[PDB]
C-alpha cells in the first residue's frame, strides 16, 4: 500500500499536495498500528490505537472532501465514476471507525489485542480505498481535459 503512494513524485497541482500529504499521514499511522500488531511500535496501549483510529478517520473525512471537490471540478468519464464509488467507500469506513472507536473506548474503560484487531482491520480497509482515490482523482483531473512514474517492466520469465 505504501508503494502506491511512494511512486508519486513532485484540480490537481492546487489541491494535490494536500491529498498526498493526507494519504502519507494515513500510511504512517497505518504502519504504526501494524507495528502494534507485530508487538513493537510507537504506540503500545489499546487507548493509543483507538486515538490513532480516530485520527485516521479525521484524515479520511478531510481527504474525502478534497477528492469530492476535484471530482466535481473534473469532466464526465469512467475514472470519475470510479472516484465517486471510492468516495462512498471512504464515507462508510470513516463512519465505522468513529462509532467503533467510541464503542471500544467504553468497553476498555468499563474494564486486549483483539480489541484493536477490528480497528486495525477497518483502518486498513480505509487505507486501501484511499490509494485508489488519489490515483483516480489524479487521472480524472490531469489526463482528461505531482506525478506518477510509469509502471515497471513486467518480467519476461516468472520462476
Amino acid at each position: 500500500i505504501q508503494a502506491q503512494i511512494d511512486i508519486f513524485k513532485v484540480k490537481w497541482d492546487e489541491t494535490g499536495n494536500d491529498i498526498i500529504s493526507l494519504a502519507n499521514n494515513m500510511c504512517k499511522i497505518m504502519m504504526s498500528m501494524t507495528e502494534f500488531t507485530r508487538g513493537c511500535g510507537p504506540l503500545k496501549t489499546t487507548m493509543d490505537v483507538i486515538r490513532a483510529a480516530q485520527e485516521i478517520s479525521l484524515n479520511g473525512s478531510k481527504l474525502n472532501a478534497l477528492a469530492r471537490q476535484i471530482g466535481e471540478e473534473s469532466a464526465d468519464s469512467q475514472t470519475k465514476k470510479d472516484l465517486l464509488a471510492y468516495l462512498s467507500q471512504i464515507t462508510l469506513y470513516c463512519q465505522q471507525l468513529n462509532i467503533c472507536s467510541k464503542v471500544k473506548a467504553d468497553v476498555t474503560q468499563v474494564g486486549a489485542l483483539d480489541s484493536a484487531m477490528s480497528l486495525i482491520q477497518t483502518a486498513r480497509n480505509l487505507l486501501t480505498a484511499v490509494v485508489q482515490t488519489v490515483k483516480a482523482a489524479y487521472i480524472a483531473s490531469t489526463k482528461f481535459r505531482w506525478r506518477m512514474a510509469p509502471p515497471k517492466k513486467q518480467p519476461l520469465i516468472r520462476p
Binding site: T91, L92, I99, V107, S118
Partner: peptide, 22 residues
C-alpha cells in the same frame, strides 16, 4: 470473532447505518 459487546452489536450497527451521510 466474539466482541465483548456482542449483545448490542445489532443496535450499534443500526447507529452506524442510520447516521450515515449516504
Amino acid at each position: 470473532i466474539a466482541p465483548p459487546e456482542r449483545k448490542y452489536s445489532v443496535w450499534i450497527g443500526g447507529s452506524i447505518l442510520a447516521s450515515l451521510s449516504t
